[PDB]
Amino acid sequence: EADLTDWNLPLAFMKKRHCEKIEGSKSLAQSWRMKDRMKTVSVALVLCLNVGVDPPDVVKTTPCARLECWIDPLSMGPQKALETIGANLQKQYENWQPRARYKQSLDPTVDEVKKLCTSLRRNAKEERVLFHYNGHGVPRPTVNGEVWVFNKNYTQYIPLSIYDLQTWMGSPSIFVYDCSNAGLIVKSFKQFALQREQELEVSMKNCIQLAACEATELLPMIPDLPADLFTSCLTTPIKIALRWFCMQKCVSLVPGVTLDLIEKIPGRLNDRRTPLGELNWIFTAITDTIAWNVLPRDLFQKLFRQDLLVASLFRNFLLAERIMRSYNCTPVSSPRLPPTYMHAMWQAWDLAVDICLSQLPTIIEEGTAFRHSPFFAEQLTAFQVWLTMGVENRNPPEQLPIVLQVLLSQVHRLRALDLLGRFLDLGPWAVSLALSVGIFPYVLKLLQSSARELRPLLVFIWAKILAVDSSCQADLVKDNGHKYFLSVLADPYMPAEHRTMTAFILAVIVNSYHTGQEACLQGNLIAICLEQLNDPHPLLRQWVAICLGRIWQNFDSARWCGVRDSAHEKLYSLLSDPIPEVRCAAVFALGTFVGNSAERTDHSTTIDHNVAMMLAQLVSDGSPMVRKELVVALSHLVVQYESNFCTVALQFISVYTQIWRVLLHLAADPYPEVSDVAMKVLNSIAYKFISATVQTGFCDWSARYFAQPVMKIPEEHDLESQIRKEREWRFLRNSRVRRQAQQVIQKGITRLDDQIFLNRNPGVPSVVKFHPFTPCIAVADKDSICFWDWEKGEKLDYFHNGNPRYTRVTAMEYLNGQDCSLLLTATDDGAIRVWKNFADLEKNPEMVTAWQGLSAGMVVDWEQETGLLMSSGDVRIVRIWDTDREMKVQDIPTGADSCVTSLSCDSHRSLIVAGLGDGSIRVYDRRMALSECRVMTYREHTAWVVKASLQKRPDGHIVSVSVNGDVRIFDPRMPESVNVLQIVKGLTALDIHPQADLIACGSVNQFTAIYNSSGELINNIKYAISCLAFHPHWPHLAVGSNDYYISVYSVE
């Protein structure tokens, strides 16, 4: 079939730079940054235990509750118990916040508490201070808002108003209450704060409160549980959770587990490899998970991330809520947390605890090896399952804090890094969520590790982080992790992709950030990048060049280092790099290097002139984006030498003169954006401020690549995609059209006189081309390009070429005609431009790319298969532009004084045929060397060659017709004509069809003679007919007379 030919056709000018507009992606407001870091400098432990005396308000049962801070007061005597409990509680708090001044008040007085609060406030005026209260030994707080304490002789309970308490305290502080009616305390505290706010007109959010029970509720008195239940939950969450687990009916699912066994559990809270440490780590991860899932982001950041003590207290407070719910007690917090007793993660907590402690009998008695719990492995597996199909912006996975927690250790660190990087590849929203959850400090700490296996995962993660947020450069420089990235980049064994990502990380680190600039200058970055400059990777070369340019951005030290390393000379190669992206990166580097001379020696003057001369020969560059970067570099040159350029400008009203001529060429550019930028830069010269400097968005546009996902399969490969199905449908239609045309040709050619329609155009039709498959005919006028239809018969679009009045659109072509086609417009002066969305209902004219060529009119002969583009005209050279590389590949000499009136080429072979005004028709083969490109030179005409077309068949025949109107059929393997014919004395235009040998001739007398190659008479249609065209498949002919009338003919 003919489908494979369509499939293996490069799509010229169809890439990211062409489709997506060049510009920087707007940076979102990154609010993940921590506003402030508070510290709990001091802790106050007021213990109104009143050992040995029961408060009159409650009559405790005979067994009652006797465990306070895991100490039985009655065993060791009253005062010794009070001191021991105070010391134990201090130790319990030190477990979470060791670095704090702990002062214990044991049955204190009002003056004693006042002195303590004043002293602690003086010690820490602007920092949080913890105030712990345990009113087990005093009557319940009154509705008035008072807390009972002891007098000196311990015979009467002297109240203490909460208003006075908060008066002694400052605004930054946290309070923990453990009493039956702490709800009353909380309500009174809030009411007094409201009273203070009312008084202030003519310290609410800052204060944090934790309460054991609601106002009405009373503390549980079950003998099994400790009396100091809320404080035990806030201090020993693992111990209290294990004890609470060992009491529920779930114990029936693991027989042989008893409180004594729980007491003799092995391991410490610090060694995570031990059972107790494993349980603590799992508990922390689960509570953090619940907090992140339930609480809003702002409150979560404010509570569970601000400081270690507050975060730990609330992480334990969630367990406190769950445990106290079963005993008709609702712990209260000043920021009202939504209930978390029903969250599904607590079921996972119970399952993990059951699995972990089920091995305890064998651990204690038999002494088995503690096998690590599979909790983290299962959670990471769930995260992987979510990632497998979590492309859509659905609910965020519940395991992000789990990934954060598992990142801390080493057992699953590698897998966690892999999954985290995969998650970050999803997009900027995913990276933002990973930053909000609090991954930045830990992913920064990973840089200290020397494990080489961590380097690729770390660079991938950090590349995504920097692509989203660029403020991380400061923290990276402060941590000195750029040495880690430099070592990564200085490893040839490392894959080129990771090296490219490391180069990007360094580039964003040094992006307009002086400290990073000099740090990397000290870091041998210039030499490292020069060593990794010629790597066979376009992306790596582009980003290395961008980084090199950014390093010496207004940095004379980096400029001097590059001078010593001959960085400019080494970068001269990249200006000839086939990839326009790499060329643009090199041009940006050269311009930035030029821009920071800062009036150095004559050596600097000479090297600047050398770089300017090297950048001057890139004027004939196909890529307008590259030319725009050329304008930027020359703007750097202009700002360096403003006085000299002003003198040169005033001279006309030898280096700067050549640069100014180059700038004139860039000003007279077909691309509107390039021309506008160049004109503005030149206009800045005449009126001679800094505001005239303009920076292109190329660097951020390239940076957006890492923002976009990379790991996933590309859309084009997708077999079931709508775009692929649409392309297949178009290919099917193209095959059907080709087959039907073949059938019509095989049936023969009948007389063609039908007139589908007759319309009038505003301007003279210069040249007409038909789209091979879609029913769109392109007719170019002097100042407009009409796009008509031969089926609906309506005007679709009306373009404006934009060329000056003197110039004219000579020839046209349909690039990528098979699908996603473009339009080529080549003016007689040299301006070649590409049009997209020319005949679409919901899209407007779009200009893909444009570039001045060369520098009869202009002659073009597009070759889709090879992708090569050739322009010919008055110049004595035929250039071969390659659309893939956007460069001129060959410039074959024509060897003729006359202009090239017509040009054609043969597919699969190099048989470039070029007619000439003098009459001779030369043929050139590009396979051999330039001086030997010319193969044959026959001369049998003395007139402008109207159309020297060539047949696509292997036996190519050059049907040459001049103004004399005589037909001569030459061949590429013969020195003489094979057939000679004379048709019309005065011929104005002609057209031929490869499939059907119909030589369509015009006439001044309105005659339209359609003959064959052998010269047989077929049709002489009766109406300066300067435009005829034939459909590549159908036997359709469009004829345009001197009048602006357009017609389309068909063979019945």
């Binding site: 922390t284 569970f304 991330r305 927690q405 801390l408 080493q410 700490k445 590790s449 494990a451």
Partner: peptide, 9 residues
């Protein structure tokens, strides 16, 4: 910090 990180060299 908020969480203790071990085994970082």
């Amino acid at each position: 910090r908020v969480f203790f990180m071990d085994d970082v060299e």
